[PDB]
């Protein structure tokens, strides 16, 4: 299970949000927390799929289109345009609730 500090729904949005322009592939996140978080660097084997069915019902991120054309050039998944002000506002946020500091 390993120790998620960021959810998994706001977790997601540094990997993204903070990627190339707000887009990445399957193992983008992982490469993301596993590099700057050292926790999970031999912890992970757990939340490793939690992304993948995370980013299926999450609310913000949603998979890439390929209908005819394309956004840019990338096939994966992102986080929602008009959404990252709100999913945002956690990302940068610590997981507590109001007992430590």
Same mark, same amino acid.
């Given at each position: 299970?390993?120790?998620?500090?960021?959810?998994?729904?706001? &977790?997601?949005?540094?990997? !993204?949000?903070?990627?190339?322009?707000?887009?990445?592939?399957?193992? @983008?996140?992982?490469?993301? *927390?596993?590099?700057?978080?050292?926790?999970?660097?031999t912890?992970?084997?757990?939340?490793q799929?939690?992304?993948?069915?995370?980013?299926? &019902?999450?609310?913000?991120? !949603?998979?890439?289109?390929?209908?005819?054309?394309?956004?840019?050039? @990338?096939?994966?998944?992102? *986080?929602?345009?008009?959404?990252?002000?709100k999913?945002?506002?956690?990302?940068?946020?610590?997981?507590?609730?109001?007992?430590?500091?």
């Amino acid at each position: 299970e390993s120790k998620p500090p960021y959810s998994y729904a706001q &977790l997601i949005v540094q990997a !993204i949000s903070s990627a190339q322009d707000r887009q990445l592939t399957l193992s @983008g996140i992982y490469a993301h *927390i596993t590099k700057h978080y050292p926790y999970y660097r031999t912890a992970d084997k757990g939340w490793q799929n939690s992304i993948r069915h995370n980013l299926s &019902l999450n609310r913000y991120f !949603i998979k890439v289109p390929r209908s005819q054309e394309e956004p840019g050039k @990338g096939s994966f998944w992102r *986080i929602d345009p008009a959404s990252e002000a709100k999913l945002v506002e956690q990302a940068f946020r610590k997981r507590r609730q109001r007992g430590v500091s």
